Write a structure and sequence with these properties.
The structure is a homotetramer.
Chain A: E1 10-15, E2 19-25, H1 40-54, E3 59-69, E4 78-88, E5 92-101, E6 104-116
Antiparallel strand pairs in A: 1-2, 2-4, 3-6, 4-5, 5-6
The complex binds chloride ion (18 copies).
Chain lengths: ~120, ~180, ~180, ~120
């Protein structure tokens, strides 16, 4: 169940502290059974868990985010999430994630992530 | 001076009929008896513990909705008026938090909020198009987050939903949701 | 793009079934149509104006209680769970206020609060023994004060009730009530 | 109806700005019909409207009050309320009211009244 998972998807390319990509197969757990359509929060968890993974800081907490679910994702798609750090301050990393199915943008998020060295 | 047993028990049944989510502790303070007394009173009355009562209230709610089912729904659906407003609670357990700090991961609260909005809308097809969210306070291991969803606009193609999430009385999460829908 | 008439009307009926106290203005903002449209929709649906809907909801409530009757009750009793919690609203009119300032007299809000506590408790005999009250903000001509009463303790002889009163979302009045009761 | 009345009872003695007494007959409007017992708020309105009456200030607003309903008042009683000013500051008058039926105390209130010269 999505809320009980740490990192969602498989990491396939990572450049620590800079950018990363993960892939996620869309199985029947991730969709509504009558339509076959992925649940927004599965794609969100992939994007947000990717940001947390790539940021090399002891603690990383999501402060804010804006997301668009641009296309319907379907049972049996593979969603490639591509994350990159746009800016970094003393307190935040600003991270953009664009997720694809083959070559069509299906999801875009902006993440404002808090961090600290504890 | 304190209530006779039979009067106290009638009064417990009434409290619970009116607020199923009232705790043993709160009942205890209400009647100025021990938690033990409240527990023994529940046993006599066949009133299940709080967590069982929540799952029972929620079962009734899953029948009122259509966009999502119990198996997929994140948290327990405690209150629903389809197309108008809804609430859920989510107990935050060890799998939802970082090991060192005990803080809930970002996607946990979003997952509660998004499924609440999906559940809220009773149309053949429903899905989130856009969302905007803020994490207002750290949520912690063993907290219960109560999410409140309400419809604020409805167009031909979208429901705009506003979500506020609480731990006790503190606001911890806030989100706007643009819900796409279609009757086909 | 906006809802077809028949869809809008279904959606109005649902909004009102779920919150009888929703205003034409609020319905208007919800569906992004004019107040005129909402009014004409109510007429088509035979939904009475807000104030009529309040008196109707309240009639049902007077049957649930026993300590007080409609004729004596100050305000309209909008929500009641006997021995647990209740709410009323009171429209503040010219007779309740000073001429120069338009401020509600002290005893008006106390009168709403006291009858709410009396109404709340469902015992043969009920009366206030003690009360402690604060007037937190000036209440004004043509405001609606919403009073919220809840039971916080029950002994063999008393219900302790806590009252909070609001104008929109501002707290304006606060009171503790020690209610005597007896079953004879 | 009590909330639609300005001054409750008849004034029978007044010493402006200092102390006053009023009497109130308890008719069937002021009681619950099944018990015959006066409503707390009728006695409160008598006490509080008496304070407001006796204070000689352009505006007088009740800020706080503590009251005790010491005896049951009954249909056909006359309640004599006796009010007096205990203290006065630049912003408040502190007023005590004790109300009687014949010679038995049936009600006691303390009132903290705000005032201003507008
Ligand atoms: Cl780096
Ligand atoms: Cl979704
Ligand atoms: Cl930067
Ligand atoms: Cl793109
Ligand atoms: Cl008893
Ligand atoms: Cl409990
Ligand atoms: Cl005990
Ligand atoms: Cl439990
Ligand atoms: Cl908690
Ligand atoms: Cl439509
Ligand atoms: Cl209205
Ligand atoms: Cl219009
Ligand atoms: Cl109206
Ligand atoms: Cl108002
Ligand atoms: Cl003087
Ligand atoms: Cl009373
Ligand atoms: Cl003085
Ligand atoms: Cl005395």
């Amino acid at each position: 169940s999505i809320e009980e998972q740490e990192f969602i998807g498989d990491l396939i390319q990572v450049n620590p502290n800079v950018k990363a990509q993960s892939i996620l197969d869309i199985t029947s757990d991730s969709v509504f059974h009558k339509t076959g359509i992925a649940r927004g929060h599965v794609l969100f968890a992939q994007a947000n868990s990717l940001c947390v993974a790539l940021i090399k800081q002891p603690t990383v907490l999501t402060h804010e985010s804006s997301i668009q679910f641009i296309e319907k994702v379907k049972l049996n798609d593979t969603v490639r999430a591509e994350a990159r750090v746009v800016n970094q301050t003393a307190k935040h990393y600003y991270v953009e994630v664009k997720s694809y199915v083959k070559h069509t943008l299906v999801f875009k998020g902006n993440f404002k992530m808090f961090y600290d060295k504890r």
